[PDB]
């Protein structure tokens, strides 16, 4: 039940772990996200294995249209994912 | 490192646990959120103990201005909180 804040900084260090390869700045493009998603969120988000699904999501975070998901853009990812968790019918 | 999806459904069942008292529908007002926040996110969000801080956040999720945070509105809460986690300087 009680996990205190390990779930917040937990998801944060998780993103830092699966999304580690970037340019000069923390670009963290769809490559890293796709990796994290297919292996971590494999059971949460509908067909998170699908690049079409991942594209949809990535593009939903990357409103910048620059192919970069920051921890903040990943924050919206967790929005999609938590939705996929409770609304696990298919947040889509 | 690897927590798979326990962090997504984890936060979800966490909200379900600390925010359990509602009306006929899952209203889940600032009372339940304040509780979860002060005890869970006590170390993450800046002065999450402050009702002024919590108000700011709650109101940020409750765009409906109806005093109801759903799991989806709590989804934006986790957006604030994950931000408070990595950007732990003070998402504010």
UniProtKB/Swiss-Prot annotation, chains A, B:
S100A12 is a calcium-, zinc- and copper-binding protein which plays a prominent role in the regulation of inflammatory processes and immune response. Its pro-inflammatory activity involves recruitment of leukocytes, promotion of cytokine and chemokine production, and regulation of leukocyte adhesion and migration. Acts as an alarmin or a danger associated molecular pattern (DAMP) molecule and stimulates innate immune cells via binding to receptor for advanced glycation endproducts (AGER). Ca(2+) 1 binds at residues 19, 22, 24, 27, 32. The gene is S100A12. GO terms for cellular component: cytoplasm; cytoskeleton; cytosol; extracellular region; nucleus; plasma membrane; secretory granule lumen. This is Protein S100-A12. It is found in: Secreted; Cytoplasm; Cytoplasm, Cytoskeleton; Cell membrane. It comes from Homo sapiens (Human). Keywords: Antibiotic, Antimicrobial, Calcium, Cell membrane, Copper, Cytoplasm, Cytoskeleton, Fungicide, Immunity, Inflammatory response, Innate immunity, Membrane, Metal-binding, Repeat, Secreted, Zinc. Residues 13-48, 49-84 form the EF-hand domain. Zn(2+) binds at residues 16, 26, 86, 90. GO terms for molecular function: calcium ion binding; calcium-dependent protein binding; copper ion binding; identical protein binding; RAGE receptor binding; zinc ion binding. SUPFAM superfamilies: EF-hand.
